[PDB]
Amino acid sequence: EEKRAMIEAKRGEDLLKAEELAAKYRATGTAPKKILGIF
Numbered sequence: 019e020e021k022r023a024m025i026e027a028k029r030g031e032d033l034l035k036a037e038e039l040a041a042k043y044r045a046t047g048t049a050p051k052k053i054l055g056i057f
Contacts (some may be wrong), residue, residue, distance in 0.1 A: 039057070042056060043055075
């Protein structure tokens with residue numbers, strides 16, 4: 019389960035990334051919604 023927490027520190031990081039894309043995509047100016055020049 020300690021490994022779990024490490025895995026979810028990566029999933030967490032990826033969700034943190036996804037929330038980061040949420041932080042970008044909340045700005046609809048980021049029209050592509052894909053791997054773009056800001057990711």
